[PDB]
């Protein structure tokens, strides 16, 4: 790739600047490059690499709704025909978006899962590809949708496994695994009461263990806390 | 809109 | 280029919907291809074309100052070395934005000055001119640092020249014109006076003339001429 | 920070 004859530190330390000037599609193609030179990645770089792609497909995914509701409202009853541009220019930003999507479900499975053996990393990238294969859930329209789904599914599930085998309630990637896996289940599976089952358990959980916490993890834990009663306060 | 993380 | 088989229609409604959707890149891309189809454009097609490059640009310069803000504190006393890689990424983005810049300069001299006979439709365009030279003069430091500077001078002093002749004080264009050629002279020509002086004379002079406005052409005038008076309350 | 248009 473009990134082969930049050292490993340099792309790290760039991925650093690039989160710093907002630059996330630069800071994804860095982090793209680390994990191409083979070695095992760092809890902080694992950090990088969620946060980059998660703000690069973030701002596409935007896109995408906002353009698909003008697609769906020049569909309706009464609406003027204005021709082809509307999906075309939605078809156009849906493509780059499974683009980034295929990028980082090869970089997870060539080579990051295979290679994860401690729970705070396999989870993570099972994490990640649950999410990547929910996003192109959410565009999918095809006779592969219900598999794109189950594969988002299969991988939270694995990550829920080992989460919960493994990982105190309070810990912060099963909170976020759980968070997002609670919505899978509101708004791709039609599953709402699994998503408001899942999201108050985690939540229940996480609050008996937080008394063996310092100070610090417990900010750390209570924030995504916040998000499963959002979730909950938003659905019930 | 829900959260995500 | 790219766009060459795409109807004009069709790249000035895409540009609108890339509008709706923040997708500036995508929307530059959409009004550089109107713009090569040759013929002239209207004012609600200038105004799409400078939102486009002026946010594309804009995201590149914030970018640039954060960058270069760290590169200079790491060339202070005491600071450890980093290596390259500051320097490395701060070009890096220098070079992007500086081909932003060619890209508009190149379409507003191929052809867009040359075929601007009105007055509204030319002194925009140079008013463009002045704008992205000014952007190339922000991130120069060689031997074309002057003369940079100078074309930035020449085109808005040419877009003031016809904005004096030709339109009212009250024109958004000649006020919005004013606003950037004053802060030209305040951060790029070492001007302060001269910048000052320039902002105080356009407001004053605006004001004299909002008597003969519309409700509507009101609102549009006095709300550039309260960003003249944001900076001349930040100078003074 | 000083306003351009
Ligand atoms: C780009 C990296 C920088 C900015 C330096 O760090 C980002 C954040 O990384 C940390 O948190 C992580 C974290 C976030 C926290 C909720 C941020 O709220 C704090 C202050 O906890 C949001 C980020 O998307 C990230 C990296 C992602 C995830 C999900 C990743 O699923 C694959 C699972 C839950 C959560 C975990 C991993 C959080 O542990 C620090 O703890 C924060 O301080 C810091 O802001
Ligand atoms: C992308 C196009 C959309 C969003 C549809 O329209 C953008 C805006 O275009 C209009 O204003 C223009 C305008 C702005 C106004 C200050 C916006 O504040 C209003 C409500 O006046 C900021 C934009 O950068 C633009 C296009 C640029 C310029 C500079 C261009 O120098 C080459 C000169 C001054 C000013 C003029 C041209 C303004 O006339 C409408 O009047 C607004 O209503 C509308 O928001
Ligand atoms: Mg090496
Ligand atoms: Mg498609
Ligand atoms: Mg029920
Ligand atoms: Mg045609
Ligand atoms: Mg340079
Ligand atoms: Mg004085």
């Not at chain 1, 409202?73 to 493509?95: A, C, D, I, L, Q």
């Not at chain 1, 989870?123 to 949708?145: C, I, Q, S």
């Not at chain 1, 299969?154 to 759980?178: C, F, H, V």
Request: proline residues 2%.
């Amino acid at each position: 790739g473009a990134m082969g004859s930049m050292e490993r530190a340099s792309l790290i330390q760039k991925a650093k600047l690039a989160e710093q000037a907002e630059r996330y599609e630069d800071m994804a193609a860095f982090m793209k490059g680390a994990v191409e030179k083979g070695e095992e990645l760092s809890c902080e770089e694992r950090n990088l690499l969620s946060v980059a792609y998660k703000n690069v497909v973030g701002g596409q995914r935007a896109a995408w709704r906002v353009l698909s509701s003008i697609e769906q409202k020049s569909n309706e009853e009464g609406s003027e025909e204005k021709g082809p541009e509307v999906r075309e220019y939605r078809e156009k930003v849906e493509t780059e978006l499974q683009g980034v999507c295929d990028t980082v479900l090869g970089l997870l499975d060539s080579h990051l899962i295979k290679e994860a053996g401690d729970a705070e990393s396999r989870v993570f990238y099972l994490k990640m590809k649950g999410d990547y294969y929910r996003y192109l859930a959410e565009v999918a329209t095809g006779d592969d949708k219900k598999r794109i789904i189950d594969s988002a599914r299969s991988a939270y599930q694995e990550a829920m496994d080992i989460s919960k085998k493994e990982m105190p309630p309070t810990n912060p990637i099963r909170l976020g695994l759980a968070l997002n896996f609670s919505v899978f289940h509101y708004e791709i599976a039609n599953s709402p009461e699994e998503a408001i089952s899942l999201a108050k358990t985690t939540f229940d959980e996480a609050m008996a263990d937080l008394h063996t916490l310092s100070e610090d993890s417990y900010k750390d834990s209570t924030l995504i806390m916040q998000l499963l009663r959002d979730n909950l306060t938003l659905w019930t | 809109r829900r959260a995500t993380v």
